[PDB]
Write a protein that binds this ligand. Structure first.
Ligand SMILES: [Cl-]
Ligand SMILES: [Cl-]
Lengths: 6, 138, 132, 6
């Protein structure tokens, strides 16, 4: 969901 | 020589340790989250810095992570003499924090923004550092 | 062209090293990373992009590039997607000086970038300062 | 006995 991940 | 002078400080956010190196003449920054405020981690960070820019002198806070053997050995090896921006950086981190799961990512987004912001023909810190060092070489 | 970098991976002692080369100067940034994943790759690129004016990165287009994370970081940073043997040699020359491979890698980057009639570190700032 | 440790 966020930049470094989902 | 002032193109080679850097200031190293620590700052703390979410229970984590961030080292911040500032190139004094330009305001350019390199920062990272590190596991612990130890000599070993501090030496590593400086070794990395020293490979990327021509670092002559680094002004530190002279605290506990600087009394041991490791930072001294790294600075000796690399030829480094140990002779508001924390707040600025934290402000930027807070603007981007919800965009990243991990603080470390937020910090590097904040470095990006700091180094590349053009506040005007007025240059960014990234442009300032290269112009200062290029001038000193030629 | 001042903004163009090449990113490759190299492997030593069962660990992964990412190497970014500034094509026009030969200047390098390299680090040991935990795993060759999108997330670690994106982090490395985000760090690079904050330090130098990175416009284009050429990658090997493998598995760590197919997911969402590197694409999201490169988008954010305005990067378009479109030396190993040398570094490994230097690493071997300094390896006994460090307990940990990561340290030897950074000593090797230092040596590579500062060896000299200009060094790679001098060449990169001259190229970029000329372009500005 | 090394640079980053012993
Ligand atoms: Cl510190
Ligand atoms: Cl890769």
């Amino acid at each position: 969901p966020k930049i470094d991940n989902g | 020589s002032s193109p080679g002078i850097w200031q190293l400080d620590c700052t703390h956010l979410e229970g984590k340790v961030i080292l911040v190196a500032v190139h004094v003449a330009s305001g350019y920054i390199e920062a990272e989250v590190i596991p612990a405020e130890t000599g070993q981690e501090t030496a590593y960070f400086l070794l990395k810095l020293a490979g990327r820019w021509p670092v002559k002198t680094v002004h530190t806070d002279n605290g506990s992570n600087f009394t041991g053997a490791t930072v001294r050995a790294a600075c000796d090896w690399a030829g480094i003499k140990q002779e508001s921006m924390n707040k600025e950086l934290k402000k930027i981190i807070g603007q981007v924090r919800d965009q990243a799961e991990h603080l470390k990512t937020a910090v590097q987004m904040a470095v990006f923004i700091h180094n590349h912001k053009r506040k005007g023909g007025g240059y960014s810190a990234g442009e300032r550092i290269v112009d200062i060092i290029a001038t000193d070489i030629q």
